[PDB]
Design a protein around this ligand. Sequence first.
Ligand SMILES: CC[C@H]1OC(=O)[C@H](C)[C@@H](O[C@H]2C[C@@](C)(OC)[C@@H](O)[C@H](C)O2)[C@H](C)[C@@H](O[C@@H]2O[C@H](C)C[C@H](N(C)C)[C@H]2O)[C@](C)(O)C[C@@H](C)C(=O)[C@H](C)[C@@H](O)[C@]1(C)O
Ligand SMILES: CCCCCCCCCCCCO[C@@H]1O[C@H](CO)[C@@H](O[C@H]2O[C@H](CO)[C@@H](O)[C@H](O)[C@H]2O)[C@H](O)[C@H]1O
Ligand SMILES: CCCCCCCCCCCCO[C@@H]1O[C@H](CO)[C@@H](O[C@H]2O[C@H](CO)[C@@H](O)[C@H](O)[C@H]2O)[C@H](O)[C@H]1O
Ligand code: NI
Lengths: 100, 199, 1038, 50, 100
Amino acid sequence: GADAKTVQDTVTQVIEQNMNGIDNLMYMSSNSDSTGTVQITLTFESGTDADIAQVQVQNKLQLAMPLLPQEVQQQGVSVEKSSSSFLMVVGVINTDGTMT
Amino acid sequence: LLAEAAKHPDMLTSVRPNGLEDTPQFKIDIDQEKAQALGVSINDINTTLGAAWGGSYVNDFIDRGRVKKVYVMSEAKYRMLPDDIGDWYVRAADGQMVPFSAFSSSRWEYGSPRLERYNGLPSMEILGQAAPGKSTGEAMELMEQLASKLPTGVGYDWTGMSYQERLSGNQAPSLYAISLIVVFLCLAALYESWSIPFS
Amino acid sequence: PNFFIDRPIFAWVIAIIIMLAGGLAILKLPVAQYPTIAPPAVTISASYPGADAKTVQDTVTQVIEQNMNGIDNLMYMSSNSDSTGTVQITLTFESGTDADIAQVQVQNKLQLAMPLLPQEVQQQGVSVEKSSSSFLMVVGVINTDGTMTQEDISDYVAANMKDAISRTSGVGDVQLFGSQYAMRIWMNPNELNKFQLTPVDVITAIKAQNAQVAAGQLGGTPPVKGQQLNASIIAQTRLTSTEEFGKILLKVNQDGSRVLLRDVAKIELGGENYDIIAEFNGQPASGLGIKLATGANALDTAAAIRAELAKMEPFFPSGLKIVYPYDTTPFVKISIHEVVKTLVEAIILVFLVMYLFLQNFRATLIPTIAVPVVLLGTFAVLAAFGFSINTLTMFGMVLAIGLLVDDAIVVVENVERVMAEEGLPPKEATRKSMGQIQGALVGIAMVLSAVFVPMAFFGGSTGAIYRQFSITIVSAMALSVLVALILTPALCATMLKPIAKGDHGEGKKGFFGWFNRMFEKSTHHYTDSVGGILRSTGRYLVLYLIIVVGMAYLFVRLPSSFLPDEDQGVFMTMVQLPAGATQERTQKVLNEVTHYYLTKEKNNVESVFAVNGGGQNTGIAFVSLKDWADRPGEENKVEAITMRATRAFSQIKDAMVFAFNLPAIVELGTATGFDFELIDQAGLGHEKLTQARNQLLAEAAKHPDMLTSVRPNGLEDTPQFKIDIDQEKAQALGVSINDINTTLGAAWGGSYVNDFIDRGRVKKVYVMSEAKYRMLPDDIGDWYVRAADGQMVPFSAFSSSRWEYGSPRLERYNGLPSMEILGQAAPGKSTGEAMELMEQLASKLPTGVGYDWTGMSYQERLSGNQAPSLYAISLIVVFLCLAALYESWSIPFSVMLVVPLGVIGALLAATFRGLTNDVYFQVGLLTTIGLSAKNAILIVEFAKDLMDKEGKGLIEATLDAVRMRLRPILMTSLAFILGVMPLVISTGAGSGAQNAVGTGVMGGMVTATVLAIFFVPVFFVVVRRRFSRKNEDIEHSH
Amino acid sequence: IVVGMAYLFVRLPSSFLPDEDQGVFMTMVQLPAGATQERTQKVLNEVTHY
Amino acid sequence: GADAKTVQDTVTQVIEQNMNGIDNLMYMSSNSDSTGTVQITLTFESGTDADIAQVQVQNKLQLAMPLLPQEVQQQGVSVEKSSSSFLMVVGVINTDGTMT
Ligand SMILES: CC[C@H]1OC(=O)[C@H](C)[C@@H](O[C@H]2C[C@@](C)(OC)[C@@H](O)[C@H](C)O2)[C@H](C)[C@@H](O[C@@H]2O[C@H](C)C[C@H](N(C)C)[C@H]2O)[C@](C)(O)C[C@@H](C)C(=O)[C@H](C)[C@@H](O)[C@]1(C)O
Ligand SMILES: CCCCCCCCCCCCO[C@@H]1O[C@H](CO)[C@@H](O[C@H]2O[C@H](CO)[C@@H](O)[C@H](O)[C@H]2O)[C@H](O)[C@H]1O
Ligand SMILES: CCCCCCCCCCCCO[C@@H]1O[C@H](CO)[C@@H](O[C@H]2O[C@H](CO)[C@@H](O)[C@H](O)[C@H]2O)[C@H](O)[C@H]1O
Ligand code: NI
């Protein structure tokens, strides 16, 4: 239900400010959506340990968590490594009009 | 800046912003006074407005042995059009139902659906490419000269692509200067000449 | 080796490649004052607004500490629980633990402690960081035109800069000197009591009229068929101004009157916190304090920060300037730059000597072009082994120039020698001498890395420091030898001018060459005399022994250091007010300091950055100094500055003020200095432990013969105020205890409540009493609680109140309550000895009072007794190497007996100046023994070889030897001693270091060579005259 | 030949890689701001059928 | 207090399902208890970096987060490196005034 300035001023900026001292930071870019979703992509220095950087972020976020809305805290704040390169995308359908 | 680049079709090409524009959004101004007066707790006006049109995750239930969520929201039809705001009432402290138009002012405004931030601060992403003839870096440079032409507080920065290139744009000649000195040194070695390599 | 003499161009390419490759292995290498010496520590910081020391200690600390289990490579865990409510738990790890994973292993226990923590703590934020003890740098911000105060600026810093300095990678912690803007609501207890309202209602209200709400969507998802409008609902949004915070309605009265917030409390855009206040030359300023992340590169991080601020600079307020009050940087920069000045010059020097003795430019370009090569290339051995262009390895280049120069020289010299003796042309001379000194060069490279590797095997952080030296030197050494087989002979045959049999350039052109005659006569005189003594050997056995013994006494009776003290261009003065004094009084003192420096040190001091805070009773000042250039004197260097300054702030004060310079040893061990921990075992109570601390303190104050500065590293118990709340009376009159609590809190403590949007940045909302109604015990009366009914009940209605003691600082080491006792050893005495005496005083303390060590003296009870094994081993190895090369058990001794002759020079060198047996003095001492070894080995070599392969007699073979490669000896040592000369001279950056290296080496060298070219013969001879039976008159074979 | 090589070099297009028909591609659809799930869906059906 | 088939398809299976692309997982086995304890053991290929693993594993689990309960969420879920072997067992006894 949040609007763009809602997530920007409830979740984002609290997370952005709690994102300090993470190793080999290159640049930090985030979208605050009126669809209620907020995404903060932190791109790192080339050839950094994917896994160590990503752990560093999920452990700074795990500290910003208590200064967040309880709706946000309960829908979950998540951390993932961003390739856009899915080996595959599998679809599933039903032929006799059966399900939605 | 879109305008300052619209002035240079010879250098830059198809300069476009990468966001969404401000759309008309609907503002419901709650007068604390009327609502606190007639007996409705502001929490109630709020979360009723929410769980009505926004929806709300409340509980967890166990479906076929897998834990799934409990979402309660308005039915579709009673939460579509601004006037429908009216069909919603709040049970006061005494015991009376109060329509929203009893404590809610309503208006249209603008707002943006997408608030972009680059490195902490509010920012706006402008994508772009160079003219048919000209090198990318040149258009990047003309962009640095145009975003320098803007009002107080308007700064600029580079990201993604043009970052990976603003790094390795000064390296290409050097590795090949090394390549030339090393190849020549190698041939001078093989032979016994400074000058025979030149052949 | 031989090959290249017929392939000079192939060799020039091997050299040009080593030089260009060493050049790329130079552009991409770490720069440092020292290497990373400090062990990795992870610190957990949290704040509990208003809490007291015993509070935080019993609410956050032990809740965190107990959850800190199963952490890998744990060294020691220490925590400060503050009367300022802050808790810091530094967990230091074994050296070289993975910074990052340890930090992960710690934060993953903090997350199990977290939900069982205060909500005030949890929401104010708990942080985990790998940081150093010390500031990499402190950035200042001021406004020149006075248009804004400290708090305003603090906002600008915290809202326009700080978030990206803390995202710069390599940046560990930033401490902010000031605080960010906040919604400050300062309550009037009277104006509250009027309307019968409490803080609690203010809390509720603020939460109420100021919030965001999940609004929703018109034409939302899922819509009904045909729907055509889709746009968002906008509801309650967080507040923007102070005005709207007044316009908050707290309670509507009967009589139509509104009670606004504006009425009940004063409202202002203000500091989130008013503990810390910063002034730059008295002008008000707010600052950035950068502490270095665990392991990251200093100079890289700092360049990244400089670029960030340069990146921010065009958007600053009118008249808002940056200042740089404290910077560890231009000193490491200018210092290593001075060591480079030495390298360039000492090369230019060696060319000068090389010309004198060889009077032929193209000839002298052989060893002058030679060294540039070995250098460049060694920077490359390091980029391969992962070392850094640091002080130790740079003083490594400086120290190694001696071994490089000596190898290049012996080559070009033996060629010239043979050319002058036998009358062969260049190539044949090259092949000849090279063929002679090849085996020698190999034996020397391996006996030299036979002494320089064992000191590489030292333990502790000290071991990192010494191995830096050991490797730069051994690797530079292998490179000059490799060069000495490739480049060097090639250049001999290429450009060395061919010399007719029997030239010796004797009295030729007179101008440049009376030297040739005079030297000639004297090299003879010399060998005549080598003989003269080579006859009576006895006395020289004696004189030698005397020299040995002297070396010993002189060695022992010399002070042992750790490192050098350095005017680092920047220092500080530190301030401690009597326990529990106020912010304003401290501010008084700090202003005094600022004045002293801007007065009786106007010429040396450029700028003072005073910082009051953390917490009222203590202040500090970062004193930046006017450029070194304009500070000539012995009095204008920091030592006398802080000396006379501390002299000022000692006598004319009410409380103590240290004025000091930061050591170069950033965050590690002092001189004779330790760091004791008094540990509670049975649960004897903060008191029994406290009294126990005083006990050890007093009992060590009893031994001025052993110890000095026996002091706690805490604050003593100050008076704390107890408001013992009667549960019964308060529940009687209608007041819920929760409410008494939170009112007393948000009044005198304050509370973080809501969040607001100032100029588009989310800042905090703090509500607290106005100043005046919460200062004096008396003001307790001014506060009321709206009871269950509707009546206000005064604090003096349910509260008894009295004075007591408590501690402002509760330290815990490895879980348990502890107290930190610093100490130093007596003036003459060893740290360890004093540590023993401490273990001996702390063994007499009450049942349950135990002890432990940390930080520096942990690092010291670790290593020791290693020097004698590593040098004993280095000796068995060197001897074994010489029995090898010389194919004799009895012969090796001669090349060893030389060790003293270099030693005694350096010990006499240190002593006869004002210097000390430190690191530099030791690496240098090594180097000196190195050349001694070289020289002698060549001597005994030629003597043996002439005796063996050209059949000569004893005395005659040695004599031949000693005569012939003497001229090189002298060439080497002049080359060095002149190259060394600068170090012992200059003042400027690092000159403590420079002078330390230089002296030891120069002094070592004098006695070394011009005692050796007289003792080495005698060694070989008395040595040989204790082997086989044919060794004089000899002849035979052909 | 040298000079000719120069001109040829400068007057040749600078790329990064070449595009590959990968048996698959995509088409993206941008409706008038605030349009409906159902109208966007109209267009998407239109494409699907095209 | 919850029962085994209660915890197992809510907490166990929900966590196990996210543990794929774990570098060098050999085999994965977990217990679901009525004494309320729920435990998931991941045994790995010989010589995978333990700290590196735990970092990856807690980085797949913090993804299984949005489908786990709030009492489970509130007392703490632990991620740890485990032997199946006591190095030693230290005893403490009392000879005299026999405390319990
Ligand atoms: C020059 C510049 C700094 O000098 C030092 O580091 C001083 C001289 C340390 O003493 C010495 C003490 C010493 C030698 O102890 C073995 C060594 O650890 C440190 C680095 O320097 C002190 C007191 C440190 O405490 C020590 O911190 C250690 C982690 C262990 C121990 N403790 C909390 C349990 C405690 O004594 C501590 C916290 O850094 C001081 C805080 C107040 C600072 O951040 C201040 C502003 C420092 O930057 C500084 C004064 O400017
Ligand atoms: C390149 C610069 C170096 C120039 C060096 C020139 C000489 C160095 C100074 C002299 C120092 C050594 O001093 C040396 O000692 C012995 C004494 O044991 C002398 O030798 C003397 O010893 C005994 C006397 O009992 C005699 O048998 C011998 O004939 C006599 O000459 C040497 O003549 C002297 O040269
Ligand atoms: C040729 C074979 C061997 C020849 C070597 C003969 C002389 C070489 C000079 C070495 C003498 C150095 O002087 C002495 O050395 C050791 C370290 O080396 C120091 O000892 C100090 O350093 C190390 C730490 O790294 C510790 O062992 C010790 O606890 C410490 O206090 C002495 O306090 C110092 O005074
Ligand atoms: Ni003579």
